[PDB]
Amino acid sequence: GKATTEEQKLIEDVNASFRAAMATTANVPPADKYKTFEAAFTVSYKRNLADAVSKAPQLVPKLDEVYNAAYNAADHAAPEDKYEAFVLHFSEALRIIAGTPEVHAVKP
Ligand SMILES: [Zn+2]
Ligand SMILES: [Zn+2]
Ligand SMILES: [Zn+2]
């Protein structure tokens, strides 16, 4: 119904902002990619999360879990591995909360 349609729109907006944050690392040296990504990611994610609080507060604990999964995987990774650890767990956890059965990326 209306709630699931609004949740899906928010999940899509979160993913699009996440992809835009990844784009900011294109021409950044490896050791600076995670800090660059994280600064870009936090601005747009916080705006998306506040939209969820307003329009679909039932989604907020699920979004919190996706972010925690990603931030915590990056937190424990060695510096050279932090960016890919975030990206991998954020994208997989977002597909899990969205109910997408193919969670590990399938190559085209
Ligand atoms: Zn930890
Ligand atoms: Zn398959
Ligand atoms: Zn996987």
Please state, in angstroms and rounded to a whole number, the distance separating the CA atoms of residues 67 and 74. 11
Rounded Cα gap, residues 88 and 90, in angstroms:
6
Count CB-CB contacts under 10 A for residue 19.
Answer: 11
φ, ψ dihedrals at 107, nearest 5° = -70, 140
Experimental method: X-ray
Q: What is the resolution of this structure in A?
A: 1.6
Of the ligands numbered here, which is closest to the C-alpha atom of 68?
Answer: 1
Q: How far apart are CA 68 and CA 63, in angstroms?
A: 9
**In the chain, which ranges are continuous DSSP H helix?**
2-23, 30-55, 60-76, 82-98
Domain hosting 87: range is 1-108
Dist. CA 13–CA 20, nearest whole Å:
11
Residues 66, 71: Cα–Cα separation, whole Å? 9
How many domains does one find in the chain? 1
Q: How far is the CA of 101 from the centre of ligand 2 (A)?
A: 9
Structure tokens at 53: 């609080």
- Residue 29 three-state SS: coil
Distance of CA 30 to the CA centre of its chain: 20
> Rounded to an integer, what distance in angstroms lies between the CA atom of residue 80 and that of residue 43?
23
Q: Which two tokens stand for residue 15?
A: 């993913």
Q: Which ligand is nearest to the CA of 71?
A: 1
Residue 106 Cα to ligand 2 midpoint, Å, equals: 7
CA of 81 to the centre of ligand 1 (A): 15
Q: Cα separations (Å) of 19 from 13, 63, 76, 87, 91?
A: 10, 16, 22, 9, 10
**Burial (Cβ within 10 Å: 0-12, 13-18, ≥19) of residue 98:** middle
Ligand nearest to the CA of 90: 3
Separation of CA 17 and ligand 2 centre (Å) = 26
